[PDB]
Amino acid sequence: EVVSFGPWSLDLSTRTLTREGQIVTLTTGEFAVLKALVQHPREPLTRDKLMNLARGREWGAMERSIDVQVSRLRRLIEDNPARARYIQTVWGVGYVFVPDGAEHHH
Amino acid sequence: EVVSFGPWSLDLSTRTLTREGQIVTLTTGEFAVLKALVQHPREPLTRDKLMNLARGRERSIDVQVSRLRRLIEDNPARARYIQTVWGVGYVFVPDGAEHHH
């Protein structure tokens, strides 16, 4: 079960993120949040749903953790982190994984 | 069970890190690694012992420690609370005391 997006590939078996031959170091949390997003393409996830998927509901009180984790994923995977395309912000709700990097209008 | 080090306080009950009245945002991993370290003061932990304590179920740890350091250390390049045990892993020194003392 390997998912691709632009130059990135994520292998959910070996829990590895690759690009251009190199395996990139992710934290367990970054991996868990990325996994959740790629397993829900084009579906908006609230910050709570993301934490519930990534880490379980016993961590729910550290919800703000997710915004930090997403911003670190973005610095890594986005052509331009300030203009994220793979992980887009759903305003007032949370985040959405767009595998093709397509804007809202398409 | 609240532990202090310099201006920092960590409440293992409410899982909150405070300084100067402000609660600081940690990731679950940063919290788990910090908890492990403060629960083992002056005991060198290998990278594996740290991962076993933090997450049960690991290069992740070095990244997590370096982020903890950027946050908690007066000078991150000269860590005093989280010191490097060369070739082994890391040690939590609550008073920030150097190796010679």
Residue numbers in the entry:
A (entry chain A): 152 to 257
B (entry chain C): 152 to 208, 214 to 257
What do the authors report?
Typically, TCSs consist of an histidine kinase (HK) that senses specific external stimuli, and a response regulator (RR) that mediates the cellular response through differential expression of target genes. OmpR/EnvZ is a well-studied TCS in Enterobacteriaceae, where OmpR is the RR and EnvZ is the HK sensor. We demonstrated that OmpR is a key regulator of A. baumannii virulence using different infection models and diverse clinical strains. Overall, the chromosomal mutants impaired for OmpR phosphorylation (D71A) or for DNA binding (R198L) were attenuated similarly to the ΔompR mutant, indicating that both OmpR characteristics are required for A. baumannii virulence.
The arrangement of the β-sheets and α-helices represents the winged helix-turn-helix (wHTH) fold characteristic of DNA-binding proteins of the OmpR superfamily. The sequence identity between OmpRABA DBD and OmpRECO DBD is 69% and all the amino acid residues of OmpRECO that are involved in the DNA binding were conserved in OmpRABA. These observations suggest a very similar DNA-binding mode for both proteins, which is in line with OmpRABA binding to OmpRECO cognate binding site. The most likely interaction site (hotspot 1) in all structures is around conserved residues T240VWG(V/L)244 in OmpRABA DBD. Residue D218 in chain A may serve as an anchor point. The “backside” of OmpRABA DBD chain C features a third potential ligand binding pocket flanked by residues K186 (potential anchor residue), L204 and T178/T179.
